Amino acid sequence: EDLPHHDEKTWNVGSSNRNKAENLLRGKRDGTFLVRESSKQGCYACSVVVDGEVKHCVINKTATGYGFAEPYNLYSSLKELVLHYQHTSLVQHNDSLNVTLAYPVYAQQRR
């Protein structure tokens, strides 16, 4: 059916505090991830949950920055980042993050 990626609130929880994020990250099966801001700083970051621990991936939008974007790959919008980040394995990070952003943190809850 429709994918919850079209919904920003499904993975966007910038309003959630870092401590609140732990609760959101806690109780979630591996694969679930959330996107949030540095709160007051313009820096962005998404946290993911792994069978091993909760992680805080960093994302940064700049004239030429976004977090995921290398000469080989270059994401123009965050919406595309979330879609591909679900098909990309985080293992590459710390060479031990065997997981893929599979479902938004607020995907199961809809208004």
Q: Mind giving me the DSSP string for 6-61?
A: G-HHHHB-TTS-HHHHHHHHTTPPTTEEEEEEETTEEEEEEEEE-SS-EEEEEE--
Cα dist. 61→42, 67, 79, 82, 105 in Å?
A: 8, 7, 13, 14, 22
Domains of the chain, earliest start first: 1-111 (3.30.505.10)
Q: How was this structure determined?
A: NMR
Rounded distance, CA 67 to CA 17, Å? 21
Residues 6+ apart with CB under 8 A from 67: 44, 57, 58, 59, 60, 61, 81
DSSP 88: S
